[model samples]
Target: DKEFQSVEEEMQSTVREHRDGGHAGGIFNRYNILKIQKVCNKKLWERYTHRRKEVSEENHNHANERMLFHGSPFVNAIIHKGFDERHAYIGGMFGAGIYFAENSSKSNQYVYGIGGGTGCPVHKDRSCYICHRQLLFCRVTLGKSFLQFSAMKMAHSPPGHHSVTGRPSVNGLALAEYVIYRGEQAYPEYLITYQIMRP
Candidate 1:
């Protein structure tokens, strides 16, 4: 049984989900775009790398295993092609916050097509395409790591989604091999909300 889908599929789904109700449009906006740009500069992103180092060596091991299971090195190569199309600009853009490049279009097409079941009408406007390409490219570059890291984070904090969030990824913004194959335990955020209501 094919229970889990591919990371590429998940990436597309994330784009639609965020656009529909999250920071989809906002991240790409002009003002916030600069934020992502600022973050993209290797100098700035080093901060995140350092922050990642803050994780314990134990957790660092966990993160590495998570990535391998999510995607093999080969699958990773295929998705990365999107970034090659634009030479990793999308990665920098997302980090800096400028989602759509100037004079580009396809944002709507991306969001709508990915959303699939209940997406908005596709738009080929300039902003749309630029945004789409940016998102697609970024997903190619940073998307996989994002998934592993976020899942790892969720497992450790405010946890109840343990099933969805297992294992951990850390250690200087890079993932190790062990953490990807092995799974970790979940953090229990739900304990606080649950009560023993005895009738």
Candidate 2:
């Protein structure tokens, strides 16, 4: 099953040159996306959509939805099984939930390798892949996010908040990491393979 499908030509260039990327404070960078694909997994996508409907309806269709980046070595499991909080980054600094970043580069830190062994999903094993990395761009439902400047460790979001957003640095240049407890609250729509270019 060739589940991965290429994005449109225009979309490709947009990804390559899109703004709103800042790895750190001083130096800014963009990516040369080698390949980008829509997840296209039937059941997976459907589950995502159903979750969205459930969330939006719960909030009267005002769910604060967004597309964010998530980088991880568990791409194989994620694409097939779906995002899991149990595999969340060690220490759970933000929270013991599925973490996503507004900045692709920030997510890149967790992108261990080219990500995937389930048949040429940009393929990789357990090794140091310095340059080319694979990450996912996912559709997320923020839904009354609890904005916090300090870190809190909870299995899920706090009380009524559907998600948690770790605030950016004081300079206001850092990326806001969104943490959600619900696995299906987000849809991993695209698998992106790219290398960071410093210019």
Candidate 3:
């Protein structure tokens, strides 16, 4: 169903499973996905379909599907209105497009939210670290990706490519990032708000 709503416990665990691992440091004992606001809009979904057709040509409709994470302070705006990139920052590693990642820690760097650093109030004295951070766990379709060895501002996909991926090119920063010029290339299906369980 293409409807915006909060998921049940079963769906929450699905997000928790994807987020529980791949954190950069051993700082937290466990990451608790406090809640998930699901986004399933029929309007943007059609945009994604059209984008796929624009990219999916070789490799027999190769829709290089990936379940990636996108951390954003405007998580609420994204699900409601649409995945618009005209307002996103242009000085990105790749270009002016939506970024997603398989590593949860990489995406964590962008999350910011409310709260006075309070853990879940279930405990008497706060020992666990509560992150008011929120992010989107999206369905990314990277069709015919190009390996970029250098940074450049691209307004659209290259002549024969639909996305750009930086796998730590030589003489460049050491970080893996996925950048897609077309916003329709992704679907923000889950909004996850997480917390740390250790001090």
Candidate 4:
């Protein structure tokens, strides 16, 4: 995270202070290009941004120069490598943002967690099981003046593990029961899976 923060800081330095009224063609605008150029070396930007000369035999019916100047690919590569360097994990149940629990008890008690879910469409790991997937918190009491927070685990069975009938397991690793508890309170929750086909 520190490393990326430094990189972002470096890029921010190169971003021009002014904005152009004209449309800058291609995948990125002028401002974005400045940012990307900072992220990548001059050689990569030049080589990919320019049209290439090729032998006629290798050329197809459509005679167009092959260029990799598209901002999406370069940006995606940079982010992917950065996250990989940080050992960031993405799984089926992975989600981003806040999640509010159902009102299980009267008196207005509330529970919530942050980040990811048990049934997202990504791979799952136990490396940071207790804290990674989601961070759980709850009101100490209904209409109480305080709240308590703790590490939590939201386990789910991804596809191809149809045999699972109880606890969640991923890649043959079964999660222990104790890993799901917050202190002595067992914060158990249920998840329902829906199979949606993409066209």
Candidate 5:
């Protein structure tokens, strides 16, 4: 989200400008209001484009698998484990820099959504929604070519939480797809502490 002056401030200036009919609140304040709104939309468009540009030919090919179910049960442990345990293993093995690679060449795809017990669709190409604000997304990365670690603020609920009160649309970010890489083995590990600078 973009930062801006409070509504009280804007309203005061807008009223002043309207009354003044000049630089006080009219043209200038409206300009400022438009500018502030434009700033975030501009930034969001640029960030969105910049993120997609980071994907490489390799990343594209890797993500083409849509979803993978490695026949090995050991690998399934990492996939089925709780968020804390899975997050721990990923952080420990990959170091404290998992987030840095979120939109970098390492990530397979990006997914955005809010909390809900549902799954998103899959695509072999750059497929996700265009966000106007700074929203949360699961920066998906493949581990051992089988398990996926889609990180944002971690998993909302473990898989299989299927109870829903109504026919709600699952809006907000969620993990989108899976990938398969060769010769890489999934590693064993545990979780780490981190701060959420945004929601």
Candidate 6:
């Protein structure tokens, strides 16, 4: 009478708790998932800002290129790893800046913007939000905060597309719930899946 009736009951409760994200393992924050994702999507200019934040000037004093691309997939694949390391600005989800690789002498030189302007397409609701093109590699729908989490994509949508058109999109609560219900039994992590797809 005073016990978890079965393993199933325990798991159901755990799922409910996890989605709410309290004292336990917060998959998003605990694992530094968002931070890691930002690293993956950083551009050249943002890389400099990230270096300033991650490593102090009094520390090693090494260049940004050496520190960031050292063990990253950028070195292994030689493919474009669009990462956004800097903090995003207000009214802006994308991070745009110039970048130059010291070793290869290669550089963007041109400060290209890296964000979706209006409505994000991945979620069912098509909510309007500042979608960071480089960071949001994995397609995830917004959950509770439909207003806050609503995404915007300027590049994808045609000019003059109204944000109101896709205001009610973003309904990924079910997907997030499913992942929590399965717990560790589900392998091929969602974040990892995104890496493979892009890399």
Q: Note the clash tally of each candidate.
A: 29, 0, 0, 8, 11, 22
Q: Which of 2 and 6 is the better model by lDDT?
A: 2
> Tens digit of lDDT per residue, candidate 4, span 47-154?
322312111222342212210111111223332232111221232122111122221110001111112122222433111112211111111101101121222222
Q: Write the per-residue lDDT of candidate 5 for residues 69-147, one digit (tens) a residue.
A: 1111122232333112233222322221122122111121111111111212342112212211111112222421322
lDDT for residue 89 in candidate 2, whole number 0-100? 53
Stretches > 4 Å off in candidate 6: 1-54, 59-81, 85-87, 91-191, 194-199
Tens digits of per-residue lDDT, candidate 1, 147-192, equal 2334232212222111221223453322121111101111100000
Model 4 misplaced stretches (Cα beyond 4 Å): 25-70, 73-199
Worst 10 residues of 4 by lDDT: 104-113
Model 2 C-alpha lDDT per residue in residues 44-93, reported as the tens digit of each score: 77877787777777676877898788878777678889877666653576
True lDDT of residue 104, candidate 2: 67
lDDT of each: 0.23, 0.66, 0.64, 0.20, 0.22, 0.20
TM-score of 6: 0.18
Give stretches of model 2 more than 4 Å off. 1-28, 113-131, 171-173
lDDT of 6 by residue, 51-138 (tens): 3443333234531222101111222121243322232222332112111111110011000122112223353111212222111112
- Model 3 residue 42 lDDT? 89
Against the true structure, whose lDDT is highest?
A: 2
Per-candidate alpha-carbon RMSD to the true structure: 18.3, 6.6, 6.6, 24.6, 20.4, 18.9
**Residue 9 in model 1: shift from native, Å?**
15
RMSD value for candidate 5: 20.4
Residue 122 deviation, candidate 4, in Å? 24
Clashing pairs in 3: none
